[PDB]
Amino acid sequence: PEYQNIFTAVQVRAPAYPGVPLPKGNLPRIGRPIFSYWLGKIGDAQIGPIYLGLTGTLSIFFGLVAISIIGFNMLASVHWDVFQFLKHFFWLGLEPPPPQYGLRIPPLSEGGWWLMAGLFLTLSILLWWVRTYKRAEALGMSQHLSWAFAAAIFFYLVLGFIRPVMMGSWAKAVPFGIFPHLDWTAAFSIRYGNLYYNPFHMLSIAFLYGSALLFAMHGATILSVSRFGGDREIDQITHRGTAAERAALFWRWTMGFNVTMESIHRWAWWCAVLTVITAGIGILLSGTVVDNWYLWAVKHGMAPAYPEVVTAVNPYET
Amino acid sequence: TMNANLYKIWLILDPRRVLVSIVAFQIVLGLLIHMIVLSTDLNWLDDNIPVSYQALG
Amino acid sequence: TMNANLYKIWLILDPRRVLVSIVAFQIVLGLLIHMIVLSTDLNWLDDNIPVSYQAL
Amino acid sequence: TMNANLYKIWLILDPRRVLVSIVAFQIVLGLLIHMIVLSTDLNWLDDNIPVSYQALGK
Amino acid sequence: NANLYKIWLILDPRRVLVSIVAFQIVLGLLIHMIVLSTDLNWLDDNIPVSYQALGK
Amino acid sequence: TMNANLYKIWLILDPRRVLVSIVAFQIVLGLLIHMIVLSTDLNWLDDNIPVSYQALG
Amino acid sequence: MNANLYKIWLILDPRRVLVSIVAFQIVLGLLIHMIVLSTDLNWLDDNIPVSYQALG
Amino acid sequence: ITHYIDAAQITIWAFWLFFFGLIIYLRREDKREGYPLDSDRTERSGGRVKVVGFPDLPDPKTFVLPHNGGTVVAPRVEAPVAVNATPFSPAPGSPLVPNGDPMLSGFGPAASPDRPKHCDLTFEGLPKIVPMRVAKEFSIAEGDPDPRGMTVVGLDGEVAGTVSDVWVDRSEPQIRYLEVEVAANKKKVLLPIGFSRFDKKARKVKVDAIKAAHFANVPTLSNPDQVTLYEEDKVCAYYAGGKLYATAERAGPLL
Amino acid sequence: SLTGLTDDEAKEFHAIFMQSMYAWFGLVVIAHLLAWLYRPWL
Amino acid sequence: LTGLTDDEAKEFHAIFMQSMYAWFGLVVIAHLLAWLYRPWL
Amino acid sequence: KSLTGLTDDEAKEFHAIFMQSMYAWFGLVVIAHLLAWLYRPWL
Amino acid sequence: LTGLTDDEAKEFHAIFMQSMYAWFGLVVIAHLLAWLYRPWL
Amino acid sequence: SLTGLTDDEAKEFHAIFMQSMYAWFGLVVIAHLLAWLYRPWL
Amino acid sequence: AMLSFEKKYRVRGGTLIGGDLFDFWVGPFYVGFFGVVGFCFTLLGVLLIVWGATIGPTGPTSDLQTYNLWRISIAPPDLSYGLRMAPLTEGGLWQIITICAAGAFISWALREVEICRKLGIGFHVPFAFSFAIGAYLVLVFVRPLLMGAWGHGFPYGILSHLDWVSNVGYQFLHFHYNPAHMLAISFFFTNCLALSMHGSLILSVTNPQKGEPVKTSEHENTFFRDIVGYSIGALAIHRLGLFLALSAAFWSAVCILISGPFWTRGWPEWWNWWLELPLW
Ligand SMILES: CCCCCCCCCCCCCCCCCC(=O)OC[C@H](COP(=O)([O-])OCC(O)COP(=O)([O-])OC[C@@H](COC(=O)CCCCCCCCCCCCCCCCC)OC(=O)CCCCCCCCCCCCCCCCC)OC(=O)CCCCCCCCCCCCCCCCC
Ligand code: BCL
Ligand code: BCL
Ligand code: BCL
Ligand code: BCL
Ligand SMILES: CC[C@H]1c2cc3[nH]c4c(c3C)C(=O)[C@H](C(=O)OC)c4c3nc(cc4[nH]c(cc(n2)[C@@H]1C)c(C(C)=O)c4C)[C@@H](C)[C@@H]3CCC(=O)OC/C=C(\C)CCC[C@H](C)CCC[C@H](C)CCCC(C)C
Ligand SMILES: COC(C)(C)C/C=C/C(C)=C/C=C/C(C)=C/C=C/C(C)=C/C=C\C=C(C)\C=C\C=C(C)\C=C\C=C(C)\C=C\CC(C)(C)OC
Ligand SMILES: [Ca+2]
Ligand SMILES: [Ca+2]
Ligand SMILES: [Ca+2]
Ligand SMILES: [Ca+2]
Ligand SMILES: [Ca+2]
Ligand SMILES: [Ca+2]
Ligand SMILES: [Ca+2]
Ligand SMILES: [Fe+3]
């Protein structure tokens, strides 16, 4: 047997770190940090403090309004009956405006709340993007997080905003609800002739699977060399240690090639980012360019053919 | 009736954070109120007043 | 009926945190109540009173 | 019939932590009970009493 | 039992009170929600009268 | 028929944790059993016995 | 206006505010254009002075 | 009208162009350590031929260390370092066999590079990894046992010593090493947390990596109140050598 | 004293707590008197 | 084991039981009213 | 010595201003509902 | 306590109140124009 | 002070800020007169 | 060829099977006993896949045979064969390739174990890879076995296996409501977010803004505390990423394992236990 470094067996405590000092113009952080013993079994025990300037304050306000408009309409849809709200929660949703209204602002009683929730969540997310940018700037760090976040925002924007406007109707955006947004996902594939045959859907899957592949590989690799301090990747990158050396040789010996302690995080960065880049393109092309992905795949010679063992007379021909 | 020692509130709440939160709250409220009214009979953009401009074409 | 020593509550509850929570609760409660009333027969925005403003 | 030493409850439970909890619970219970009542025949908002104000405009 | 008081030598009096208070509130909410889901519902039973009918 | 030295079970198993496990298990079990019974023909709440109280309105 | 309003720059970073106003105003300008294009006031697809697709 | 070319097909081809460019970019970044490769082609070419594959190595980047710590470049020319081993067979692709007593050979899982002889620093510039004797603001989290005073046992259950102190990370609070006062020689040696299982009820730390008698040769610290990167790797590698070397059965195979 | 109040402090808080609780309960009773008169539910 | 002395555990138990009986007493009364208003068995 | 940090005199002063400000807030609440009741009585 | 002295709190309050009232005066004028243009009650 | 500006630096910044903002608002007014003349919306 | 620091790690021994017989490298690759065995399974499987492409579903002369990369498909047997071996040209080829794949996959993982033993590193990577193998084996062994026919396996074709997924999913009307499937997707999505967060942070502190020194552990913790009020820690982020990726694989296996063997109706209707609870 051996220690697997999954749980911290013996936690130590020190007075909470208030954070690296930020340049003038940043607001003071807020909150008195607390320690969670149980969070400390799997990771860092400190919770807080937090930074909250104008960007994040504006972001949270937009976001609370958006979330409440959704919940209010969910509760209204079971006539304020809290017990039925809990019964039906996973089924409830806030529905996009009917197609008859196009891209015009629809009535409060029939779609106006969705558009307001969509506007304010979108602004809330865009302000959160600025927050990720500013927090790196104040620490003197490069902008990799905000670049990756922008890729996720791109996909989010394509789903609910760019494509509906291109298609001339808010009715083609996504409803706010757990199971309702799953209906939207399945119905979208049905309507557009089977999303499996969308090549950017295929790529997005390759990269989503690859993210789990790469984090399983990297996550597992680092814990196996954490006995050599391999989790301390900053100093393994500047001052290659036997942690970084043994990690590369494990993979070199397994599959014939390897990366570095720094560059695995580039592979990881791009794999995750390409998941949502290709997803946005795939949705951006659906309805706007390709109306039936299967027939598009047939046209370019991709669709498999099978021996005919079932077949049906088309009653519309007869 | 306003209190004469009300100014001491700025000994309790941080003046800078108050200013930041009011600005944030009012930008949200302003957008929210404009949008609610646009989704009702009071809408002034699609009311075809003084005319409908999509009909001149 | 109120107590003569009720002011001592500020020896117990932080004045700062209480004030912030009150205005946050009241703002959220006021948004909620305006929402509820608009969603009912009491709606004063879409009631066409004094007139309907949507012209043909 | 309460106990004479019941005040000693504040030797065991923090009065501060208790007061915040009561306020939060009471606020939520109040919001909860109002919503339940609105969901029933007891609804006092959509009952059109004294009159229906939407009819006035349509 | 005569020595039952020693239970407070074994189980923390402070967490037990909190657990009893927390459990009783949830149970009370749960039981009301159960009864209101059945024929015994006293809120939507139009007793003594239907107030929505009173407004039609 | 119990044994005379069964009390030594508390030299092996923690009496506090057993108590808390028993209390936790019994509450869970009671909630589970009531909901099971409420989901069969034996349901005593929606059986309109002695009367249907919705039919009074 | 108060004579000492200039003292605001003793409490708010001038450089940060200037940048935040520019971004706020640009976003606001994009937002408002999009609103107007979604109304009867739309000036791009109104076929005024003429429809250019109807010429080909 | 009809056309075979369409925008979905155009865009997917554009993605492949981007993607293959990305792959070559990534493969360049991958060669900032360990390259050019050590081959027998470079030996026989008299060094004329450098094995680097495709794509070739990028132009060097610079890492600026805080607190005037200097500059690191990548890729970099690294001096060859002798291998304390002899080939099992002269044929290419054969493993090597450690010279002498394997635990002390610095070869195989006992091996490690020569990291810098300085201490990793906190943002404020203090030695990052230090014993609790020095960082008096640290304590053991309530609910967990204090390792100080626990007994250290080797892979064979024999008493190797006692935990004499605990070495913590001042930047991101956690135990990184236990300090073990070895019974046999009364020296104080580091024990990485990665090699330590706590048996809390027994107040024993179990180390599967080495035998009790192997603790005498844990590499020693030049300075008892701080640890250099160089010493960190030498310490961890010595325990790791035991995983393969500490008993005969560990050589394998199973069948 | 696990909370940190002395015995006299715990007595003073209890007195003010019970009075405030009863005053709240008085308000709750008055509110429900009006609701039963306005819209009896049983 | 909890920190309470034997006398403290005795005093806490007396008040706890007295309070719980008051709570249980109230529960029976509420149930009696519920049974008089809407007998459920 | 207190648990908030305020002395007794400071807490008395805050209470005075707090109660005056809160009653002024409640006074505003009441006027709005009389206007609302006169405009749109709901019971 | 926010770290302002008593005189700074006096000065900030006077500017805060004068500035807030100026903002409120704009809101009223806007609503007077809105009420004259499209009365909503 | 909090921002590091001196009192006269805040004075100088404020005067240039108000003049530039007024010039910006002046442009917005010109734009709305053109828009009102072209496409009145009330 | 070797990494410039590699030679001092190429130690003899640590094999599970084989010892000195196969204890050698071939270029970068370590071979060993499970290298030899895995190579044979792999080359056979790949060559049998290509042979299936060569003859197609109905012989090399038919219009259905194709080397088009998207359209090549080697399919499992008809369900009527149950747990028996079908003829090679009627799905038996698929059956032999499946065993090769399992043997290829399991041999790869055991080779990894021998490499860990040489390097004196933890066994997390072969342990984690076992979850992927388990999911493949749930798909082609456990789930077909519980339902009684190897033909419930999926076909080996780049696009044809998406048709399998599609038609198996819609057997349950609305497969999105599978609870293990929802949970698994949450893990897949959360894993992708976490991976982008981790990659970004390491690159942003080791490649700071121009003129800045390399940033510190204190910067990393401060940075996410500044954004979300919490930092999990540089060790724990690797703990988290492994947990999320493995959880995604595990609940994948669960979600397909229950679809047929432990549930036969539509997946939305499963949630009626919730709806029918006596609370509402
Ligand atoms: C509608 C959209 C809605 C979006 C809403 C978003 C909301 C937010 C809005 C605000 C956005 C603000 C944007 C940032 C503002 C300024 C930030 C800044 O600080 O700039 C200075 C910044 C920093 O300067 P620096 O000195 O480099 O500092 C770097 C640090 O030292 C440390 O640097 P480093 O050492 O880590 O290196 C940096 C990194 C650079 O990486 C990045 O920073 C950007 C990452 C990309 C993000 C976008 C994804 C791209 C998707 C492409 C795929 C699309 C499919 C179609 C393909 C088309 C292309 C052909 O290096 C690389 O990774 C190299 C990448 C090489 C590219 C791929 C290689 C192949 C290229 C082609 C090869 C040839 C083709 C033929 C080959 C033939 C043979 C095969 O300037 C830069 O150089 C970096 C540029 C990155 C900023 C802009 C781009 C990212 C941000 C926008 C992303 C938007 C995504 C949406 C995509 C939509 C679908 C297409
Ligand atoms: C039928 C309905 C009416 C109408 C009814 C009203 C009414 C009624 C009011 C507004 C108000 C506003 N309306 Mg409107 N509105 C109409 C049509 C429009 C259209 C449009 C494209 O049709 C636009 C873009 C606007 C835009 C605006 C803003 C200027 C303002 C909200 C500001 C805010 O939230 O600040 C939030 C930001 C802050 C509070 C920060 C505070 C700091 C300092 C004090 C403010 C500095 C910012 C800047 C100077 C504010 C510019 C306001 C001045 C007039 C220059 N109106 C139609 C014609 N509108 C409000 C207003 O004028 O406020 C005075 C208001 O009360
Ligand atoms: C058909 C049903 C009736 C009705 C039946 C009742 C009944 C019955 C009661 C209420 C009570 C309340 N109702 Mg109602 N209610 C109706 C319609 C409304 C509407 C509306 C838009 O129509 C609103 C906004 C309210 C709002 C409120 C609150 C003022 C109050 C609960 C506060 C709470 O939970 O405090 C929790 C917070 C705390 C405990 C913290 C401490 C309290 C602080 C110190 C005091 C805060 C102000 C206080 C609540 C003032 C109450 C004064 C009057 C009696 C209203 N009612 C309709 C007409 N309502 C309750 C009440 O009056 O309580 C006294 C109550 O029992
Ligand atoms: C047949 C249907 C009956 C009905 C049958 C019953 C029955 C039967 C019981 C209740 C009980 C309760 N009901 Mg009911 N109930 C009805 C309608 C209502 C409505 C409503 C909107 O219609 C509401 C809001 C309530 C609310 C409540 C609470 C007052 C109480 C649960 C408290 C609890 O969980 O304490 C848990 C929390 C603690 C134990 C914490 C410790 C003590 C706390 C700090 C002090 C609490 C004060 C206590 C509530 C004082 C009230 C006693 C009065 C006699 C009611 N009832 C209808 C008319 N209700 C119970 C009850 O009366 O309990 C005594 C109960 O057994
Ligand atoms: C029927 C509706 C009208 C119309 C109604 C209006 C109205 C009304 C306004 C605009 C304004 C603007 N419109 Mg428009 N707009 C129309 C058609 C267009 C079209 C188009 C493709 O048809 C475009 C691209 C634009 C673009 C623009 C921008 C030039 C400007 C907003 C800038 C901004 O947000 O700055 C925010 C940036 C800052 C605050 C930074 C600080 C200041 C900087 C230095 C100014 C930069 C230069 C500035 C943009 C130059 C433009 C001045 C011209 C006088 C317009 N209009 C149609 C024809 N538009 C606004 C404007 O002109 O503002 C003066 C404005 O008030
Ligand atoms: C468990 C979390 C995730 C995960 C982790 C995981 N995978 C891993 C590892 C780990 C930890 C490795 O260490 C190992 C590795 O070495 O990666 C570089 C591996 C690996 N994961 C791989 C693939 C991969 N993993 C996937 C998924 C996942 N792996 C997870 C979601 C998938 C998906 C989602 O489809 C694939 C494509 C390989 C890159 C590698 C294992 C390489 C290997 O075992 O090589 C030997 C086998 C061959 C070279 C080919 C064998 C050919 C067969 C004999 C015939 C083919 C039959 C096959 C069934 C046909 C399929 C046809 C159609 C479906 C197209
Ligand atoms: C009563 O409830 C309270 C208040 C207590 C709070 C509770 C809230 C709850 C429970 C909320 C629950 C929310 C849930 C379950 C939400 C689930 C949401 C899901 C799954 C959403 C999934 C996808 C949604 C997407 C992708 C939506 C995208 C929408 C976009 C991008 C819309 C953008 C719209 C814009 C930008 C509109 C602009 C308006 C213009 C400018 C055009 O105006 C003319
Ligand atoms: Ca829907
Ligand atoms: Ca108009
Ligand atoms: Ca009106
Ligand atoms: Ca009414
Ligand atoms: Ca009733
Ligand atoms: Ca009954
Ligand atoms: Ca026009
Ligand atoms: Fe990492």
Taking CB atoms and an 8 Å cutoff, what residues of chain I touch E48?
40-42
Q: What CA–CA distance (Å, rounded) separates H193 from A6?
A: 12
Helix (H) or strand (E) holding H188: strand H188-192
Please tell me the distance between residue E46's alpha carbon and the centre of ligand 4 in angstroms.
22
Q: Nearest residue of B to residue C31 by CA position?
A: B29
Here the contacts of H248-255 (C-beta below 8 Å, separation 24 or greater) are H250/N14, H250/N117, H251/N13, H251/N14, H252/N13, H252/N14, H252/N15, H252/N16, H252/N19, H252/N114, H252/N117, H253/N15, H253/N16, H253/N17, H253/N18, H253/N19, H253/N33, H254/N15, H254/N16, H254/N17, H255/N16, H255/N17
Chain centre to alpha carbon of residue A130: 17
Q: What CA–CA distance (Å, rounded) separates N150 from N152?
A: 5
Give A284's contacts (C-beta < 8 A, 6+ positions apart): A158, A162, A163, A166
Q: What CA–CA distance (Å, rounded) separates C8 from N264?
A: 66
Cis peptide before H80 (omega within 30 of 0): no
Q: Which string of DSSP letters, residue by residue, matches F2-55?
A: --TTGGGGGGTS-HHHHHHHHHHHHHHHHHHHHHHHHTSTT-SSSS--S--SST
Mutate to test the pocket of ligand 5, among M16, M24, M27, M37 (most ligand atoms within 8 A of CB): M27
Q: How many residues are given for chain N? A: 280
Closest alpha carbon to N23 in H91, H38, H250: H91
Residue N156 CB–ligand 6 contact under 6 Å: yes
Region of M31 please: left (phi>0), alpha (psi -120 to 50) or beta: alpha
CA distances from H216 to H157, H161, H181, H219 (A): 16, 10, 10, 9
Closest alpha carbon to N173 in A88, A186, A189: A186
Cα angle H137, H140, H143; round to 5: 145
Taking CB atoms and an 8 Å cutoff, what residues of chain D touch A79?
38-39
Cα angle A9, A12, A18; round to 5: 135
Same domain, N160 and N35: yes
Structural domains of chain N, count: 2
Q: What CA–CA distance (Å, rounded) separates G9 from M7?
A: 9
Query: Can you list the positions of beta strands (E) in chain N?
Result: 25-26, 29-30, 73-74, 156-157
Residue D33 covered by a domain: yes
Q: Whose CA is nearest to atom 4 of ligand 7?
A: A68
What backbone torsions phi and psi does residue N262 show, to the nearest 5 degrees? -125, 5
Q: What CA–CA distance (Å, rounded) separates A215 from N191?
A: 8
Q: List the determination method.
A: X-ray
Assigned token pair, D6 = 């019941």
When computed from its CA atoms, the radius of gyration of chain N, rounded to whole angstroms, is: 24
Assigned token pair, A225 = 């060399």
- Please identify, by atom number, the ligand 2 atom nearest to the C-alpha of residue B23: 40
Count of Cβ atoms closer than 10 Å to residue B6 Cβ: 14
3-state DSSP call for residue A13? strand
Give chains near L: 3+ CB pairs under 8 A. B, C, G
Among 3.40.50.300, 3.90.50.10, 3.40.190.10, 3.90.1150.10, what is the CATH number of H110-251? 3.90.50.10
Can chain C be said to touch chain N, i.e. do they have 3 or more Cβ pairs within 8 angstroms? no
Q: What CA–CA distance (Å, rounded) separates F57 from H21?
A: 75
Q: Please say whether the beta carbons of N74 and N52 come within 8 A.
A: yes
Burial annotation H68-88 (CB, 10 A radius, 16+ → b, else e): ebeebebbeeeeeeebbbeeb
Shortest alpha-carbon distance between residue G31 and chain A (Å): 10
Instruction: Print the domain residue range for G41.
Output: 5-55
Mutate to test the pocket of ligand 2, among B18, B33, B34 (most ligand atoms within 8 A of CB): B34
Q: Nearest residue of N to residue E39 by CA position?
A: N280
Assigned token pair, C6 = 């009720």
Same domain, N11 and N103: yes
For residue L3, count CB atoms less than 10 angstroms from its CB and return exposed for 0-12, middle for 13-18, buried for 19 or more.
Answer: exposed
Count of Cβ atoms closer than 10 Å to residue A108 Cβ: 21
Q: What CA–CA distance (Å, rounded) separates A208 from N169?
A: 19
Here the contacts of N79-82 (C-beta below 8 Å, separation 24 or greater) are N79/N149, N79/N151, N79/N152, N80/N149, N80/N151, N81/N149, N81/N150, N81/N151, N82/N148, N82/N149, N82/N150
Count of Cβ atoms closer than 10 Å to residue G16 Cβ: 17
Closest alpha carbon to N233 in J18, A12, A77: A12
**Residue with the two structure tokens 């410039």:** N4
Same domain, N116 and N233: no
CA distances from L30 to A67, L25, L40 (A): 30, 9, 14
Closest alpha carbon to E5 in M32, J7, A257: J7
Count of Cβ atoms closer than 10 Å to residue K13 Cβ: 16
Distance from first CA to last CA of chain A, Å, rounded? Answer: 73
Which residues precede chain breaks (C–N over 2.5 Å) in chain C?
none
Can chain H be said to touch chain N, i.e. do they have 3 or more Cβ pairs within 8 angstroms? yes
Structural domains of chain G, count: 1
Q: Please say whether the beta carbons of B15 and C24 come within 8 A.
A: no
Same domain, N164 and N252: no
CATH number of the domain enclosing B8 = 4.10.220.20
Cα angle L22, L23, L25; round to 5: 65
Give chains near J: 3+ CB pairs under 8 A. D, E, F
Q: What CA–CA distance (Å, rounded) separates H13 from H88?
A: 51
Closest alpha carbon to A103 in A160, A167, A175: A167
Assigned token pair, M5 = 């500006």
CA distances from H25 to A278, H61, M39 (A): 19, 14, 54
Taking CB atoms and an 8 Å cutoff, what residues of chain D touch A75?
35
Give H93's contacts (C-beta < 8 A, 6+ positions apart): N24, N25, N26, N27
Q: Give residues 1 to 56 of C whose Cβ lies within 8 Å of K.
A: 6-15, 42, 44
Instruction: Print the domain residue range for N109.
Output: 1-171
Q: Please say whether the beta carbons of A178 and A224 come within 8 A.
A: no
